[PDB]
Amino acid sequence: MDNKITPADEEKIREWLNCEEASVDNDGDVWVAVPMTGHWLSDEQKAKYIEWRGDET
Amino acid sequence: LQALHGYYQRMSADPDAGMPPYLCGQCLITGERQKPIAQLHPSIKGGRDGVRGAQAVASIVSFNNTAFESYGKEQSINAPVSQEAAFSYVTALNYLLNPSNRQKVTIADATVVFWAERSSPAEDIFAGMFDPPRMHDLLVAIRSGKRATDIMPDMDESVRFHVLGLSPNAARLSVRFWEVDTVGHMLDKVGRHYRELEIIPQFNNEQEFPSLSTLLRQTAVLNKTENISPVLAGGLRAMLTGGPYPQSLLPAVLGRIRAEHARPEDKSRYRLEVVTYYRAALIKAYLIRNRKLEVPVSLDPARTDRPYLLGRLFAVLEKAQEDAVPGANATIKDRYLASASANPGQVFHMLLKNASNHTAKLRKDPERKSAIHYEIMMQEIIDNISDFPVTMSSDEQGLFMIGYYHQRKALFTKK
Amino acid sequence: TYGIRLRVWGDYACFTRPEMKVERVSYDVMPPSAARGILEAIHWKPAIRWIVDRIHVLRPIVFDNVRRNEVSSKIPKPNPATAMRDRKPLYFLVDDGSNRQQRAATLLRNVDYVIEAHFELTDKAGAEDNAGKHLDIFRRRARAGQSFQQPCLGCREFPASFELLEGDVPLSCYAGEKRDLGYMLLDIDFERDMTPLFFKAVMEDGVITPPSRTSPEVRA
Amino acid sequence: MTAIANRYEFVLLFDVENGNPNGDPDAGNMPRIDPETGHGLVTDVCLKRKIRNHVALTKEGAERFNIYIQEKAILNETHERAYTDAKRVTDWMCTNFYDIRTFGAVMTTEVNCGQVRGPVQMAFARSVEPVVPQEVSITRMAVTTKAEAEDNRTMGRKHIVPYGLYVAHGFISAPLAEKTGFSDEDLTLFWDALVNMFEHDRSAARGLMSSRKLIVFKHQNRLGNAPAHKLFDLVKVSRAEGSSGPARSFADYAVTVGQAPEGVEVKEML
Amino acid sequence: MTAIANRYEFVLLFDVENGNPNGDPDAGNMPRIDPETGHGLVTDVCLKRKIRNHVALTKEGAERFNIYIQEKAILNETHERAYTACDLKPEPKKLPKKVEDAKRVTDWMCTNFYDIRTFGAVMTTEVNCGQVRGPVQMAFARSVEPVVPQEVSITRMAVTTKAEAEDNRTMGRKHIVPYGLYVAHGFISAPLAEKTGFSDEDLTLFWDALVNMFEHDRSAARGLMSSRKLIVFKHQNRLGNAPAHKLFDLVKVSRAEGSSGPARSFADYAVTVGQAPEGVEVKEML
């Protein structure tokens, strides 16, 4: 399966986190802010996300 | 909501102006036992074409985070509604959210959608009744306490009416208020609201029924739709439940009056007022409802309240200033209104001395005796006051503001 | 004669709807579940089950909005042994990005209820466990103001003041009104894997009478 | 296990001078005020956060007094654990994290729902009389973006409560403590934090906040000896006879406690 | 730069004579007042600005002693300095993906700029340099007696644009407080100081600045402003020995026995400092 985060996930990322800001870099790392302090999701949070994506589709 | 469900069941009956498309548990929407529960509810329309402000994919029920999950249940088993119901309510909401249909209005940050339990002309009226543009005649009638039937015989007032307010939380949207009153009852309540708000116009271009958004905007941190306190937008529930307005309203308008100043960037002849028509209307509503006071629509010089008399006195001093130094870019209303209303004992001495200097200049100039008239008004207003109070309450400040607005309007072109 | 009549009131209350837990929305009236909780906060033992006969709504229904910063996640389980095999700091940081959650609330104000309830012995009751004994103990605690914990109007932020009614119930604002509040949370059947069960809350004269939570015909 | 022996009630009075005691995320960060009465409002979780932070600073990770729910204003230099069918893990969590022991917690998973209560409970703190916040306009020297440099100054706004005395009620239930090992050492540290909450919480927004009084009704019985709502009635915080107009310092308020029923004591920690 | 070890509170007394200590952007330019009681106010922000000015004037941009908020700076251009000095490419709108590099950039911001080290900053904008809370805090200054701001009209005998009014002169106005004594509290935090790097050298400079704050702030609208007391309460440990309010209260500001009528000089006021708790020492010698 395509276990990779992409800009097409950004709306979904926003949703998941409920943050009013998201940004995926060129490699696949992800960023979020506004309801939260701007920070990069950790590996475990990325895994959580992907699971979320898979299950809550 | 099951109200939404019932609305879908209503509109779905007709082949137009609607749409007929189609573990287990107790459906809380319907109340039917052993029905297929939805694991993930269908999405709601966000964005400017749906609930403004929320993301395009909005939802009522959302258990994406571990905090909100309860009694061992997962993503929508916590909120058990049958699939059918899930579809239904969502669809009805979406149809009401489509602006092509007249059943929608946007207030501050929240979008309001309303409907009657069965077809009634109310659904076409309430769209404008709390955002006023026959409709004007109806508004005047209900403000007079007349029954709606006298202007619209087809208005069956026994029909139950519903109003819903949705606020955006990124992907999540929240219920801010909810009313299920009957058309006649809440129409009478709106009539009473508009009756309380009534004040003589400041300039003849201001509308007779101030749109609730315009009323709220005037308390905004910069007089723009953004910076409206969402809690005040929700509090003005008070309009059509008939209860007291939120107690934070009067301090909010008084705070605006403190922190405002006359911007000449309107580029009209007049420099923008500090106590505008709408702020005075809100203050009158707050004093009528919460404080049970008596407030007139126009000036009532046959009155003996010290706060009111001080407001009138401030108005006449301001008029004397603006006559003594025409065209100036600042006036006492820009600086000393906030402290005059809240602490008369400390500032009215300096305002009266400055007004004395203004009348001094005016006496020698032309207008050689409006110099006398303003002093006569000061005599007749000061004559009723025993002392300047050390401090005044919030509602006493409201009466001060109302008196200032009244005496200012009644003096634009008296002399 | 056989029964209880407990009064509760407080400034705030939040009886959150199950379909709006994420962005709190309160039931117009205290559900029997909440009632039960309140009752158990005063006196309760495994041997006895509380049943809510009537719930009176004395003060009128009023709503208000409060918004709070909140945490998005339950704290994870450490393993006691591996938790110390290599000494490590354990914490939950509310400022670390995703941790922060905002959560509105649609909560009641100035509530005032009278709860009519009675006891029922559980199947695991002791042979010597008299129901009259527990009735007396609860009445003593209610009269003296004693309690296991301060009863709360749904949520711990909302403590409930309480008194015991020995006299006739006072009249409500809705004394001559009828109102159907729709389907609302009756209880939670913990035996049947913790699903909610709902009832049609028809308020009349300001008093609500839900069906017995133990009814076989309500339960699956 | 050891635990506190008596139910306690406490009424905490604190005040703010030219500060934002607790902002409203739903009202542009203006300080909260109660819509039904006009009283200023401070959420309990706002105060619990202060207690947590103060204990974290003071006990600096001692064996039995670590804190779980931190915020990123902490240091990692030193730590230690007590290290005493799912009861084992729960009581391990309770025995070394002060906040989980005192206020309770929730853990991710259990056959049960994973709830820990803790004995302490406290309610929304509301003003003694209505407060009217003031909007303060402030201006900055520099500009943040190069775009807005296109002479250069930006205007902000700060919201302050000129003054207001807030009454915070709270309840300590001994029976809950007995299930959580909340002992008298924890209780004394807790009174210490309530007295000293706002000492370490200084920042640009809050101005000067201080705990002025802390009355403690100590009961005789394991349960109470009088209804809490009737106990709170004895703390008649009212205005000093010599003061009129807005209250601007604690001297403007006179607070007294009546004779509590014989079964319950009283102590004024402050 | 080793951090300080003691918790400090301070009380600052300062004067104003025929000056506008702090203008209110709303009331035209009127001195800030508490509208409900008439007491004058000075935003803590203004005093922080004067401290910053002092730092910049006395250190003149020496290393470890630059200031962050300046009269014509652009914040992003300053943050790019930190990113470059850390060799990181400035991540667009974001922090560096490595937490250690984020800490290094934030510390370089703290360890260089004096006022970031002191008062803290919120730098999470565009090029992101993180957040700092500031070991140092101070509250709004508030007068000990209500002030009476008076409005002074003035004229200019020349005009900027093409005008024909001069038939009367071009009018302008100044607002001034005839006199007022301002009591400004402050706070210094060891725990946060350690996390920032606030050293005793810094602290010395800080008291210096406070004492010499106004001496270089002279302007046509400021009048004559002076520092009258700096009562510092040094606690003997990291965490104080006495509640703040319990120390502020030792500092009593009253009106001299022989003084009547409106105050017009420091001599109208009697300042008394009580006996501090045994865990505190007072250095009113400042």
UniProtKB/TrEMBL annotation, chain B:
It holds the Pfam family Cas_Csd1. Signal peptide: none annotated. Keywords: Plasmid. InterPro entries: CRISPR-assoc_prot_Csd1-typ. It comes from the Bacteria. This is CRISPR-associated protein, CT1133 family. It comes from Nitratidesulfovibrio vulgaris (strain ATCC 29579 / DSM 644 / CCUG 34227 / NCIMB 8303 / VKM B-1760 / Hildenborough) (Desulfovibrio vulgaris).
Automatic annotation (TrEMBL), chain C:
Keywords: Antiviral defense, Endonuclease, Hydrolase, Nuclease, Plasmid, RNA-binding. It holds the Pfam family Cas_Cas5d. One of its GO terms (biological process) is defense response to virus. It comes from the Bacteria. It is an enzyme of class 3 (hydrolase). GO terms for molecular function: endonuclease activity; hydrolase activity; RNA binding. InterPro entries: CRISPR-assoc_prot_Cas5, CRISPR-assoc_prot_Cas5_N, CRISPR-assoc_prot_Cas5d. Its EC number is 3.1.-.-. The keyword Hydrolase applies. The keyword Nuclease applies. Belongs to the CRISPR-associated protein Cas5 family. Subtype I-C/Dvulg subfamily. CRISPR (clustered regularly interspaced short palindromic repeat) is an adaptive immune system that provides protection against mobile genetic elements (viruses, transposable elements and conjugative plasmids). CRISPR clusters contain spacers, sequences complementary to antecedent mobile elements, and target invading nucleic acids. CRISPR clusters are transcribed and processed into CRISPR RNA (crRNA). This is pre-crRNA processing endonuclease.
TrEMBL record, chain D:
Keywords: Plasmid. CDD domains: Cas7_I-C (cd09689). It comes from the Bacteria. One of its GO terms (biological process) is maintenance of CRISPR repeat elements. The keyword Metal-binding does not apply. This is CRISPR-associated protein, TM1801 family. Pfam families: Cas_Cas7. It comes from Nitratidesulfovibrio vulgaris (strain ATCC 29579 / DSM 644 / CCUG 34227 / NCIMB 8303 / VKM B-1760 / Hildenborough).
